[PDB]
């Protein structure tokens, strides 16, 4: 409750006392009479009054407020929902110089269609090659892709049908922001935020093209001095994952180095970049450690459960942050939450060909301890079906 909601009996006594002091001149009321029923109604009406006031208080609370009211509240504080995004990239086309060009150019990359973003020049330049800024036609995450070759849909005289994706990637494509995600993003702005600059830098680095996820420094990456006490980092460092361009989303050093240069500046700490004055830091990447996962006992379940369990374990391993252990208990919980608590189901984490990898150690208990600057990578999920089913045969 938020207002008070007094004891019912006391409220009814007060209502009856008022009605007797005013209307009946101080005398009590005959039970099951017109005045008794009048008093009972009033009471019901005042109970509804209390309720309406309570909810009118609720309708001005960021956490419990209808979406429309939520958006209207957040527009007063500077938080607006995020619109839908179109994918983007560059296309390099070639042909004989001097040919005619029109604004109706459309490219077919894989299964998607793309269009010119800027104004197309009137004539193909004398070099014989044109590089064009290109956006997708359909908004959302479908426009994102990792392709290198494409064809021209609308044929133009003197221009070869083969075009190239200049860069090999199409970033940016995102969908509309829901109401619950917008609620939890607005409510993160009013609440008291310690280490505000860390979350600010993360939320800014998330805007770099094709940056899928942003993570803090994992647990396997803390540090201790000679005395035996934890040291707090004086800089601002974190990891990023380009999950739809590179293998495992791990990018080479040059990309994250450019991201660092864009975010903090060069030299860092002078406010030349995005961050404030006197804010140093470093954006990092990781090295992949290949892991095989083996699920035993999954042939006893219905095909739907097997398929969903494999999907969920693949999803979990692929989204595991860098510098964090891949314990057997987590995979086993993923399997238990689907198959039930009395199902036989055993998982095993191995290295491909039982080879040693840098930054990977198998503790006795069976986990995969992963050192700093490294990240687990799902090589393959294999299920061992030794013909065991529900009824012999």
């Amino acid at each position: 409750c938020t207002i008070q909601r007094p004891d019912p009996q006391d409220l009814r006594n007060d209502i009856a006392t008022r009605f007797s002091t005013n209307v009946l001149g101080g005398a009590p009321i005959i039970p099951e009479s017109n005045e008794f029923y009048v008093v009972s109604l009033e009471y019901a009406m005042q109970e509804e009054f209390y309720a309406f006031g309570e909810q009118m208080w609720r309708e001005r609370d960021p956490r419990f407020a209808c979406c429309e009211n939520l958006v209207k509240m957040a527009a007063e504080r500077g938080v607006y929902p995020k619109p839908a995004q179109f994918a983007q990239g560059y296309v390099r086309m070639t042909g004989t110089p001097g040919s005619a060009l029109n604004q109706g150019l459309r490219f077919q990359f894989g299964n998607q269609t793309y269009e010119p973003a800027s104004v197309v020049p009137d004539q193909l330049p004398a070099t014989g090659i044109l590089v064009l800024r290109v956006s997708a036609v359909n908004p959302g995450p479908s426009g994102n892709a990792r392709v290198t070759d494409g064809t021209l849909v609308t044929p133009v005289p003197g221009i070869s049908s083969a075009v190239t994706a200049y860069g090999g990637n199409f970033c940016g494509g995102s969908d509309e922001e829901e109401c619950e995600q917008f609620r939890t993003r607005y409510l993160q702005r009013l609440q008291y935020q310690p280490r505000f600059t860390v979350e600010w830098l993360k939320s800014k680095a998330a805007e770099w093209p094709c940056v899928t996820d942003v993570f803090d420094l994992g647990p396997n990456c803390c540090a201790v001095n000679a005395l035996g006490e934890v040291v707090c980092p004086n800089n601002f460092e974190f990891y990023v994952l380009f999950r739809d361009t590179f293998d495992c989303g791990l990018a080479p050093q040059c990309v994250v180095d450019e991201i660092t240069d864009w975010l903090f500046g060069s030299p860092q700490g002078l406010g030349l970049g995005e961050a404030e004055f006197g804010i140093c830091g470093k954006v990092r990447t990781a090295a992949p450690v290949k892991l095989d996962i083996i699920l035993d006992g999954l042939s006893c379940a219905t095909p739907a459960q097997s398929r969903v369990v494999e999907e969920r374990v693949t999803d979990f391993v692929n989204r595991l942050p860098p510098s964090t252990n891949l314990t057997i208990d987590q995979l086993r919980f993923i399997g238990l939450q689907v198959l039930g608590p009395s199902f036989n189901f055993n998982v095993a984490i191995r290295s491909p060909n039982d080879a040693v990898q840098p930054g990977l150690r198998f503790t006795s208990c069976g986990d995969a301890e992963i050192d700093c600057d490294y990240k687990a990578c799902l090589n393959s999920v294999v299920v061992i079906n030794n013909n065991v089913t529900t009824s012999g045969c």
Binding site: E68, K72, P81, P139, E176
Partner: protein, 263 residues
């Protein structure tokens, strides 16, 4: 064909603004160490209009927003778009038109008033460069004043003093702009155009404040309820809701002078 004195026509003032903008804006005829600054100011103005639209639309989910946002971004990211007066003016006018078509009435007040404040500054560059930047600022301020007038007209006046105060605000902005466009014979023509649009906005806003609903001040003997006042004035007590937007005073004691509509 009777006239149309219930509505503003914003076409002549926008054409005059186009003329006065393209006369004093040519980033190909200013000194080379100032073109980047001038063009960055232009892009900053377009960014302001974009933010205005993004704050006024809000919960507009249809794909038309989803495109308009992409069009704004495609215009802003490009580099050679604002180096031409034609493209810059088309972007500015179309941005203001899209900002207009996103809401109706009061919703577009705060936004537009912020814009009037943004372009209430003057340029420190000299010669032709300062004239170009000032052309940017003047275009923004005059378009904002015109569209704020159109926004005021789309909503009903709650009190004669309120409508007259809104008209006072807008007429003051327009007179300020005319004095600017007349200071040392910059352009006489835009001064005359602004003067004409000012007299037009005067006729429309004054008619709105005095005659859209014919507000009268009824004199009641002693303060009275809202329902009783509504029933005695109109003969219809359900119109009590109408007596609350204009009168301040507790619902059980409204008066003893009650503003309302003619009968």
């Amino acid at each position: 064909l009777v006239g149309n004195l219930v509505a503003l026509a914003l076409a002549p003032i926008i054409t005059a603004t186009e003329g006065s903008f393209k006369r004093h804006f040519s980033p190909d005829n200013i000194r080379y160490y100032n073109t980047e600054a001038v063009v960055s100011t232009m892009a900053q103005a377009v960014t302001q209009v974009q933010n205005a639209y993004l704050a006024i639309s809000g919960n507009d989910t249809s794909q038309d927003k989803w495109t308009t946002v992409r069009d704004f971004r495609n215009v802003l990211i490009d580099e050679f778009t604002f180096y031409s007066p034609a493209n810059a003016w088309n972007v500015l006018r179309n941005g203001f038109a899209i900002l207009d078509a996103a809401a109706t009435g009061s919703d577009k007040f705060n936004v537009l008033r912020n814009l009037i404040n943004w372009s209430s500054t003057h340029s420190d560059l000299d010669g032709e460069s300062g004239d170009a930047e000032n052309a940017i600022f003047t275009a923004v301020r005059v378009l904002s004043a015109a569209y704020l007038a159109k926004a005021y007209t789309e909503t009903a006046a709650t009190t004669v003093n309120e409508g007259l105060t809104q008209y006072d605000l807008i007429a003051a902005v327009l007179e300020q702009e005319a004095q600017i466009a007349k200071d040392d014979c910059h352009d006489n023509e835009f001064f005359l155009q602004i003067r004409a649009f000012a007299v037009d906005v005067a006729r429309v806003m004054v008619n709105r404040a005095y005659n859209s609903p014919s507000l009268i001040v009824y004199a009641f003997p002693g303060t009275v309820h809202g329902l009783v006042a509504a029933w005695e004035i109109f003969g219809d007590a359900k119109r009590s809701r109408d007596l609350e937007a204009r009168n301040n005073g507790s619902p059980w004691a409204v008066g003893p002078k009650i503003i309302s509509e003619r009968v």
